[PDB]
Tab-separated table of C-alpha atoms and ligand atoms in Angstrom:
chain	number	residue	atom	x	y	z
A	1	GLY	CA	-11.097	16.767	9.856
A	2	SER	CA	-13.447	14.556	11.861
A	3	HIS	CA	-12.659	10.863	12.283
A	4	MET	CA	-8.925	11.551	12.497
A	5	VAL	CA	-7.883	7.888	12.516
A	6	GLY	CA	-9.467	7.642	9.064
A	7	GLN	CA	-6.443	9.645	7.849
A	8	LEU	CA	-4.079	6.759	8.572
A	9	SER	CA	-3.519	3.413	6.886
A	10	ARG	CA	-4.914	1.219	9.662
A	11	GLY	CA	-3.398	-2.248	9.388
A	12	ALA	CA	-0.332	-1.193	7.404
A	13	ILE	CA	2.102	-1.954	10.232
A	14	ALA	CA	0.827	-5.513	10.564
A	15	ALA	CA	0.934	-5.854	6.765
A	16	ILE	CA	4.532	-4.670	6.595
A	17	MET	CA	5.638	-6.932	9.428
A	18	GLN	CA	3.467	-10.028	8.676
A	19	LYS	CA	3.332	-10.070	4.860
A	20	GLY	CA	6.355	-7.957	3.974
A	21	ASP	CA	4.336	-6.408	1.152
A	22	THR	CA	6.226	-3.365	-0.178
A	23	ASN	CA	3.928	-2.189	-2.971
A	24	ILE	CA	1.712	-0.379	-0.479
A	25	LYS	CA	2.139	3.364	0.043
A	26	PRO	CA	0.827	3.629	3.587
A	27	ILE	CA	-0.038	6.828	5.372
A	28	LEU	CA	1.435	6.885	8.865
A	29	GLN	CA	1.849	9.364	11.702
A	30	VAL	CA	5.219	10.135	13.230
A	31	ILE	CA	4.943	9.799	17.003
A	32	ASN	CA	8.595	10.406	17.797
A	33	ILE	CA	11.993	10.735	16.151
A	34	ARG	CA	15.413	10.406	17.707
A	35	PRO	CA	18.980	9.961	16.588
A	36	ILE	CA	20.592	6.607	17.154
A	37	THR	CA	24.176	6.321	18.308
A	38	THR	CA	26.564	6.950	15.445
A	39	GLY	CA	30.269	7.719	15.737
A	40	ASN	CA	31.940	8.683	12.476
A	41	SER	CA	29.004	8.375	10.111
A	42	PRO	CA	26.197	10.682	9.115
A	43	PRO	CA	23.607	10.753	11.857
A	44	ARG	CA	20.812	8.204	11.615
A	45	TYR	CA	17.248	8.629	12.816
A	46	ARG	CA	14.852	6.097	14.305
A	47	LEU	CA	11.101	6.730	14.158
A	48	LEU	CA	8.218	5.580	16.286
A	49	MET	CA	5.366	5.511	13.736
A	50	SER	CA	1.636	4.864	13.981
A	51	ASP	CA	-0.936	3.504	11.540
A	52	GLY	CA	-3.796	4.342	13.921
A	53	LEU	CA	-4.032	0.802	15.360
A	54	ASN	CA	-0.416	0.066	16.164
A	55	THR	CA	2.836	1.860	16.798
A	56	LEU	CA	6.181	0.439	15.729
A	57	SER	CA	9.607	1.728	16.775
A	58	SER	CA	11.700	-0.182	14.219
A	59	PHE	CA	11.583	2.433	11.446
A	60	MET	CA	14.830	3.998	10.296
A	61	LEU	CA	15.222	6.912	7.952
A	62	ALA	CA	17.464	6.523	4.910
A	63	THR	CA	20.245	9.053	5.384
A	64	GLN	CA	19.234	10.796	2.139
A	65	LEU	CA	16.094	11.886	4.024
A	66	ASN	CA	18.017	13.390	6.964
A	67	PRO	CA	17.366	16.961	5.770
A	68	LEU	CA	13.622	16.449	6.390
A	69	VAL	CA	14.361	15.980	10.082
A	70	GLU	CA	17.129	18.539	10.346
A	71	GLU	CA	14.972	21.253	8.720
A	72	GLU	CA	11.948	20.168	10.820
A	73	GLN	CA	9.422	19.263	8.088
A	74	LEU	CA	9.453	15.751	9.491
A	75	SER	CA	8.661	15.823	13.219
A	76	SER	CA	6.402	14.416	15.930
A	77	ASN	CA	2.697	14.457	14.966
A	78	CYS	CA	3.202	14.934	11.255
A	79	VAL	CA	1.365	12.653	8.856
A	80	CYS	CA	3.305	11.201	5.967
A	81	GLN	CA	2.869	8.844	3.063
A	82	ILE	CA	5.599	6.267	2.553
A	83	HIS	CA	6.451	5.946	-1.141
A	84	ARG	CA	9.379	3.538	-0.924
A	85	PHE	CA	10.586	1.341	1.907
A	86	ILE	CA	12.517	-1.823	2.481
A	87	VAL	CA	12.492	-4.342	5.272
A	88	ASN	CA	15.759	-5.739	6.549
A	89	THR	CA	16.207	-8.542	9.035
A	90	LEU	CA	19.064	-8.597	11.504
A	91	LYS	CA	20.993	-11.711	12.492
A	92	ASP	CA	18.988	-11.956	15.730
A	93	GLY	CA	15.683	-11.985	13.828
A	94	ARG	CA	14.587	-8.424	14.511
A	95	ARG	CA	13.270	-6.463	11.574
A	96	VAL	CA	13.999	-2.884	10.638
A	97	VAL	CA	11.913	-0.887	8.164
A	98	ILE	CA	14.027	1.567	6.169
A	99	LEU	CA	12.107	4.556	4.821
A	100	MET	CA	13.612	5.562	1.461
A	101	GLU	CA	11.027	7.990	0.116
A	102	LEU	CA	8.211	9.745	1.856
A	103	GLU	CA	6.002	12.767	1.555
A	104	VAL	CA	4.732	14.859	4.465
A	105	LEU	CA	0.998	15.241	3.863
A	106	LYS	CA	0.293	17.287	6.979
A	107	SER	CA	2.806	19.169	9.096
A	108	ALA	CA	3.094	18.513	12.818
A	109	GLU	CA	1.592	21.944	13.474
A	110	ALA	CA	-1.450	21.161	11.314
A	111	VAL	CA	-2.159	17.861	13.092
A	112	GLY	CA	-0.983	18.623	16.605
A	113	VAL	CA	-1.869	15.449	18.474
A	114	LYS	CA	-1.304	11.712	18.413
A	115	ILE	CA	-4.205	10.317	16.394
A	116	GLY	CA	-6.266	7.574	17.976
A	117	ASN	CA	-4.968	5.189	20.623
A	118	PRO	CA	-2.471	2.972	18.819
A	119	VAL	CA	-0.805	0.191	20.825
A	120	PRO	CA	2.678	-1.252	20.346
A	121	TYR	CA	2.982	-3.927	17.671
A	122	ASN	CA	4.386	-7.155	19.073
A	123	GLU	CA	7.122	-8.703	16.920
B	201	1DZ	C1	15.511	-3.254	15.525
B	201	1DZ	C2	15.865	-1.812	15.387
B	201	1DZ	C3	15.097	-0.982	14.583
B	201	1DZ	C4	15.418	0.359	14.449
B	201	1DZ	C5	16.513	0.868	15.123
B	201	1DZ	C6	17.281	0.041	15.927
B	201	1DZ	N1	18.399	0.599	16.615
B	201	1DZ	N2	18.247	1.489	17.578
B	201	1DZ	C7	19.429	1.851	18.051
B	201	1DZ	C8	19.626	2.837	19.147
B	201	1DZ	O1	20.709	3.466	19.273
B	201	1DZ	O2	18.679	3.039	19.948
B	201	1DZ	C9	20.416	1.130	17.326
B	201	1DZ	C10	19.690	0.330	16.399
B	201	1DZ	C11	20.267	-0.619	15.393
B	201	1DZ	C12	19.675	-0.767	14.147
B	201	1DZ	C13	20.207	-1.644	13.217
B	201	1DZ	C14	21.340	-2.378	13.523
B	201	1DZ	C15	21.937	-2.231	14.765
B	201	1DZ	C16	21.403	-1.354	15.699
B	201	1DZ	C17	16.960	-1.300	16.063
B	202	1XS	O1	20.039	4.712	2.591
B	202	1XS	C1	20.210	4.306	3.771
B	202	1XS	O2	20.552	5.106	4.685
B	202	1XS	C2	20.031	2.866	4.106
B	202	1XS	C3	19.786	1.809	3.221
B	202	1XS	C4	19.709	0.638	4.042
B	202	1XS	C5	19.918	1.085	5.353
B	202	1XS	C6	19.932	0.288	6.610
B	202	1XS	C7	19.884	0.984	7.809
B	202	1XS	C8	19.889	0.299	9.009
B	202	1XS	C9	19.942	-1.084	9.008
B	202	1XS	F1	19.945	-1.735	10.161
B	202	1XS	C10	19.991	-1.786	7.812
B	202	1XS	CL1	20.058	-3.514	7.835
B	202	1XS	C11	19.988	-1.100	6.605
B	202	1XS	O3	20.093	2.385	5.323
């Protein structure tokens, strides 16, 4: 409906990256999904997600969720609620947000556009 950005958990990206709070169940929009280079492993997917204010490209799907992508319920423009995630920090200091459980609240076809004008989150 009207006020589309009101559908998304504005500020959740900053909260995840600044406070590391994991009890939240934020509602985010998928902007894009792509495989990352794997060799002899199951494929792994990276997501560019939006909370309406920011985008963040450091989301990775737990492999148990791969069927959501491969059967196309999880795709660009869909709106989803994250029910379980963890943050991991690499040796170089970069953080990755691993999505363990999520629910698609609105299909890509039912949303159809990038909501709002989110800007990339900086570190
Ligand atoms: C920081 C971050 C967040 C999400 C995905 C990535 N990422 N993207 C690619 C790729 O192939 O593009 C590879 C990685 C990667 C992730 C973890 C460890 C090593 C490499 C990196
Ligand atoms: O269940 C899964 O697939 C899973 C659990 C944890 C990770 C993971 C993925 C990428 C990473 F970089 C790091 Cl540190 C962890 O993946």
